[PDB]
Point group: D3
Chain length 127, copies 6
């Protein structure tokens, strides 16, 4: 039953990526956030960062700091020299593995990918 079986497999995986995609920049259950030079804040989740990107969660733990936002404590991390759109796309990749990266952002993404050791994303950007 190859077609039924592969069909179920792809469908399940598609639901999973849509489900985690809905958590990108989602303040619900967010325990970490990134502030970009524009002042914009991007909500994230240590779960994803730890699971997907050891250098990034290390940076969060070392360079992040306690902040109160709307009466709720979080770990804020400054993420400088990058557009908010590029930062958001980088998080989207960690959450969803989506390879459809906007070509206008490749330079930034590759810089992010490089800084935090996301080899696979470097390759996406070079290609």
């Amino acid at each position: 039953l190859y077609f039924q079986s592969m069909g179920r497999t792809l469908l399940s995986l598609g639901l999973l990526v849509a489900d985690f995609g809905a958590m990108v920049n989602n303040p619900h259950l967010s325990d970490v956030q990134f502030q970009t030079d524009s002042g914009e804040v991007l909500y994230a989740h240590k779960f994803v960062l730890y699971a997907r990107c050891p250098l990034l969660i290390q940076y969060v733990n070392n360079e992040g700091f306690s902040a109160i936002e709307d009466g709720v404590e979080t770990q804020r991390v400054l993420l400088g020299d990058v557009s908010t759109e590029a930062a958001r796309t980088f998080l989207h990749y960690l959450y969803t593995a989506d390879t459809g990266l906007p070509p206008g952002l490749s330079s930034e993404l590759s810089s992010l990918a490089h800084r935090f050791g996301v080899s696979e994303l470097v390759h996406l950007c070079e290609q």
Copy 2:
């Protein structure tokens, strides 16, 4: 939504082939049957034969003849010089496009495929 979309596609196609597979040698709605030299009768359906194999439905219409089985009229067709297992497998291919052909049968199948112009099945058998 590539994964959801391809998943749904493969799943639907898998159901379709399982559904038509259940009609192979199924006397329900059968309006044609093949008698092999062993005396065994294989039930089939002109719908499939017409849609999938012009040379076979032509042979059915030209060489077939009226027969009564259990009080019900059908078109019986003699299909000589082939094992029942090979004939059954050939019908299975017309109904399901299943390419997993038992290697022990390839010579017979290829002969059937050749006689009735099923090019694609010839190729499966040579390979």
Copy 3:
């Protein structure tokens, strides 16, 4: 030989769906037809309906009636409250498992799918 093997598999399945697609609304070997409220008649084949959709063939057998068209007897079935285009698309799905459903029809299709228990098509329509 994965690529040769999967290639042959997809190719065979593609031929099968094209072959059965050519039977949609095809009066040849048609033993059942649907009349829509517009007066348009859609030719079908009990083979497909029985194999693919138990609730639909049950409705055909229970609610259908004998009709003579061009001197030939068939089972006519009234299929009300649905456009001919939606009915035709529903049959196309039963014959081919094609998931590319015209978005303009999704409401009708979903109603058809629901009425005749085609779960998979309900899902296609919701998504």
Copy 4:
């Protein structure tokens, strides 16, 4: 560049599922845990449960309670009438969408899937 592109896509998705798979029953960053009738505790992460399974996170929030384990506070939730292996497999599905479910567990899984509205997993279990 279809093959390079689909290759990169599947590879990225494969890394993602392996990365999240490593978080199944992983106490690191765990903010919720399930206690089964055997007394065994399964570590989980509200991030996944919220994103993937609304009925389960609702049950966690409503029926869960504060617990201290090794001096650290978490939300403990009793998950009765199910083997630990079945519970663990259910979490594995929420984290990874893996469809390769051990057949010995299908009855339990289907019961879990049903209770928490994971339609897709019900289907996997029936098939």
Copy 5:
């Protein structure tokens, strides 16, 4: 690890076809060339022709002749009655197996494919 494994597989194959594609009409290491009726010369490589197309390398060996171009000896072969674009596309297929054939060329390609026994390309052209 199906997704990682198939991903690596497709990616490797994609690199291979891009690498050999870069050799189409590439004079580097060319030991055979085709002259079309326009006077245009197409560089090729006996390696590919021998491996992929027995009738073509046979024609090269039988009908080709020694030629000096820029002080370097090669085997020149006249390839008449075909546009350079069609000849180039035919070579591209032998080097890369690319099935995306420009529809404007199908008649020529099919003639080439026929003359040199490239069954698979005949089929691409008919379809």
Copy 6:
């Protein structure tokens, strides 16, 4: 016609890899060969090496030397510190992109892959 189209695509690519696979260690049209420390000679083809592996063809051109074998001149290259089986597998990868590498050879292959810059093969070996 997705299934017919992808089927044709995979089938063509499968033929291509089988065709080039038949050239691995094939003395026909061989213009370069590798001698391993066991004394065994592996036939190769500069076409492939140039197209697929710049560092390897550079090594061939710089370190290779003229040799006469059975009265025919070739470029012989010493390839030390590696088993013949590992060397042969490395060539097989350059010719076919086959990712199914024998696990017993991964250390050698990775050393070869590293020495000649075949990044993709390094990754196959680490995984």
